[PDB]
Amino acid sequence: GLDNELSLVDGQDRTLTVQQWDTFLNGVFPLDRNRLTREWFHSGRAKYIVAGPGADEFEGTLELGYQIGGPGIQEVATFSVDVSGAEGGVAVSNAHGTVTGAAGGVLLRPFARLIASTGDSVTTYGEPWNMN
Amino acid sequence: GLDNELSLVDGQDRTLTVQQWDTFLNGVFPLDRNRLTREWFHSGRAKYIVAGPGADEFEGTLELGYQIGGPGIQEVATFSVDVSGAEGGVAVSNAHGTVTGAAGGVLLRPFARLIASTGDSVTTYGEPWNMN
Amino acid sequence: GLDNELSLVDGQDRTLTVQQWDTFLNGVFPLDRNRLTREWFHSGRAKYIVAGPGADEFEGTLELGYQIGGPGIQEVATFSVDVSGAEGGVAVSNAHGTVTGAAGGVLLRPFARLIASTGDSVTTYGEPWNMN
Amino acid sequence: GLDNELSLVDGQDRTLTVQQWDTFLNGVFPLDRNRLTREWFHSGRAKYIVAGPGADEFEGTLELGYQIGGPGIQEVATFSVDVSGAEGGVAVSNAHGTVTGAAGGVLLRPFARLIASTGDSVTTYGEPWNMN
Amino acid sequence: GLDNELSLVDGQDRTLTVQQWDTFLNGVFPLDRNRLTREWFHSGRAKYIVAGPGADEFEGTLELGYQIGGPGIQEVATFSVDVSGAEGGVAVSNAHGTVTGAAGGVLLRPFARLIASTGDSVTTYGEPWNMN
Amino acid sequence: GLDNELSLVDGQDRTLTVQQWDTFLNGVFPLDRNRLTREWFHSGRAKYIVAGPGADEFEGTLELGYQIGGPGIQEVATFSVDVSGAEGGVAVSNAHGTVTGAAGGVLLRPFARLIASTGDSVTTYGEPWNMN
Amino acid sequence: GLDNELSLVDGQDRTLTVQQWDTFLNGVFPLDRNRLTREWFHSGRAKYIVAGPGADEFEGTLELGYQIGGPGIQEVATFSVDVSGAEGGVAVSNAHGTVTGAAGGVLLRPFARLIASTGDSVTTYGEPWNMN
Amino acid sequence: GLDNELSLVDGQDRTLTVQQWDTFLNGVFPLDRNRLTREWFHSGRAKYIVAGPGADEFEGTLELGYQIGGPGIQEVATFSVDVSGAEGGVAVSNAHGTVTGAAGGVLLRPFARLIASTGDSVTTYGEPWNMN
């Protein structure tokens, strides 16, 4: 269910909330049979909520992915999507991810993000999953 | 026939399914006569289904391909295509595939995919074939 | 005449055919006078046939070409063209080809492909020609 | 609360203000476990005010971000957005930053900026945060 | 007069003919005074004729030039133009050609080509001239 | 106040004036702590005036900035904007500027520039600021 | 006066002439004052005439320039312009040319070209000027 | 005042005149403080006049600038602008020019240019200014 959430009061007195549900980063033995290589499958669900003046008429983007820490830090957006209304969620099952040159372990920071067409944004973070 | 399938209850309470059907990964002698080269052709069929609120008005995309595990991990989309309606599925005969630098064998993971215009996606993966 | 053909029943219950006619791959003495160069001319004809529910309302694409095997494996589409209606076909006399770096031997794999705008496709292959 | 602010009387006798609120530069352990990487999270509120003739008909861009100082000087705009009217503001929570090759210590100079469609720009700055 | 010509029975039973008249490849001492350079001037005539159903309303392209062979095999198109009608033809006087690195001779292969808006194509070549 | 100005009688008998006001080049110890780096903040006002026939219908561009002198000479326009009519001007406070490989010293030459839609232009220069 | 000319019976029985009048290639002592450099000023006129069917409705393009023979053979088009009517001409005075790396001397072959919108072209050539 | 002019009787019996007025090329102490470096300011006026049939009907380009002679020959167009009418002219005060690798002296050849939409051009030249 609910893994983590965070709310923020935007610069128009709306209470923006974003949520990270049912996160599962499933590691697998690499298709390339290389010890340096990490492969896994991202599953999970982002939801958002908005309370306050003009909630029912909302215009933002909703995101879900993670950061990879190995040969640096890069961010993967598994999906990134235009939403409207004061509520909603989007779910993913078996997104494919991989990275190589992985010298001694690979950590994965899962996030959920809400971005308003008004520029505002809030993002919630769960605890990293260790890919080794 | 039915090789594999998977379901996701999506973010609007639509039960999304995707099926992988009649897959053949045909390994043949390479046209370039190099021992380092694999050549297959891809055959098979993806099917999707969606029950729930608004099933006969679903918009998304249907894909089918495989991952190449050898010189590294790369995903190949044999086809990728905008669908509509509660059901349907597109089938492929004799895609061409090939790869070189194939230092000892080459593995292949075939996947079928349902992604919706609402951001949600599900992918069904089958068991790898070993070109070698 | 008819060199080869294949048939695929597509995901909307149409019996899709593809034929490959009159093929010639005229190999010739290289204009660069290089022993490592191969120079050739494609001639041939693609045609196709759709039957079953909704045939006179078909949108897809037809192709004719070859893979080149030797320096690597590379696909050349001598022609690639939009098509509509239940039958069609197109022809080529003296298309031009040349490759170099050729470590002795160039094999040639001639094909005809009908692709469907509904994402489906079928492709007929003939027996490789030897350019040396 | 309010961290810093600055006001410019621009080229058409509007007194343009810009403000920087609630600033957290949250330093954390680098996901890549690398001693030469720095990783943080930016959180902040940006506002502007315009007084004077035609204030209610002001067009411009509002921005929040920082400068990174270590491997050189770079500017990062956490956000940058169009604005209309004489008041406005936008807030960001948990934006992710990172930089590497960080040869002893990293400093972060945070700003809020207001640029007018008439070419005028005022930018306010805080005291640098130290990422080590 | 007529050097050569070829006919093709295209995908719609139009008899496509293409012609090449009055060819001259005028080789001359290179403006750079270099042993390794070949310079010349290209003269010739391209003609076509279409026979059968839908002829007098024909859509295609007409081309004239040659292949160069020395440091590789490269096609030059002295002209390429759209045409309509069952008949037509365009001529060229003193086109300019050069190539360098001409490590011992350069051969030139002249062609007239006709291509149809229907995908079908026919091309007639003459025997190579020897710029040396 | 006014730092400097210059005027031109342009090719259509209008007297173009440009002016540079309240220039400040705020040199500060650099954020990268690097002895070859220079960092500063630019603040300033540009104004123009057009006299003569058709003055209330003048169209041009107004620019303000500086040349950087050390690693070479490079021009930076802090801003560049389309203006209309006989009068106007724009202002900038705390714009950010930096440059590295400053092998001993950097000199900064400040300017304001008036460019007319008719191609004409006048540019006034201040005395160089020594960023060391 | 007239330096050179050439006519061609084009592909629609029109009689197309192109002419070259008053050529001058004035060699100067080069501005860089490097003796590998050649520098010059080009002057000339190009005229055309089109007799026969539909002459007064002729649509073409008119070019004039020279080839450079030294580091290789480059084409320079001093001008290239849409002409129309059975008659026309355009003149150039004092165009700049330069080439460097020129290993003892440079030769220049001046040309006048007439290309027609129907794809036909003719081009006349004068005897080369030696630029040393 | 007038530095130089040239006239040309053009392809349509228009006498085209270009003139160069008030030219100043002002060398200064390089801002980069490098004795390999030249830096200057360009000031000047270009004017044109046309007489003959259709003079009020004239469209062209008017340009002013100079060639640089030093690390090579390069032409700088200080302004280049579309004109209409039998008379016109545009002026520039203080344009900035700089060049480096000035391996001893730098000559600047200033020019003014009249280019007709009909293809024709005339360009008047001054005596070079020596940049050291």
UniProtKB/Swiss-Prot annotation, chains A, B, C, D, E, F, G, H:
Keywords: Cell outer membrane, Cell wall, Ion transport, Iron, Iron transport, Membrane, Porin, Secreted, Signal, Transmembrane, Transmembrane beta strand, Transport
GO cellular component terms given for this protein: cell outer membrane; extracellular region; pore complex
GO molecular function, one term: porin activity
Phenotype when the gene is knocked out: Single deletion has decreased permeability to the antibiotic cephaloridine (9-fold), glucose (4-fold), serine, phosphate and iron Fe(3+). Growth rates are wild-type, due to the other Msp-type porins. A double mspA-mspC deletion takes up less cephaloridine, glucose, serine and phosphate than the single mspA deletion and grows slower than wt or single mspA deletion. A triple mspA-mspC-mspD deletion grows even slower and has reduced Fe(3+) transport compared to wild-type.
Source organism, top-level taxon: Bacteria
GO terms (BP aspect): iron ion transport
InterPro entries reported for this sequence: Leukocidin/porin_MspA_sf (IPR036435), Porin_fam_mycobact-type (IPR015286)
Localisation: Cell outer membrane; Secreted, Cell wall
Induction details: Constitutively expressed.
Function: The major porin in this organism, forms a water-filled channel which favors the permeation of cations, amino acids, iron Fe(3+) and less efficiently phosphate. Does not transport Fe-ExoMS, the predominant siderophore. Plays a role in transport of beta-lactamase and hydrophilic fluoroquinolone antibiotics such as norfloxacin as well as chloramphenicol. There are about 2400 porins in wild-type, 800 in an mspA deletion and 150 in a double mspA-mspC deletion.
Written domain comment of the UniProt record: The rim domain (28-96 and 152-211) is accessible from the external milieu and is partially embedded in the outer membrane. The stem domain (131-148) is inaccessible from the outside and embedded in the outer membrane, while loop 6 (121-127) is thought to be in the periplasm.
Full protein name: Porin MspA
Organism for this UniProt entry: Mycolicibacterium smegmatis (strain ATCC 700084 / mc(2)155) (Mycobacterium smegmatis)
Higher taxonomy: Bacteria, Bacillati, Actinomycetota, Actinomycetes, Mycobacteriales
Name of the coding gene: mspA
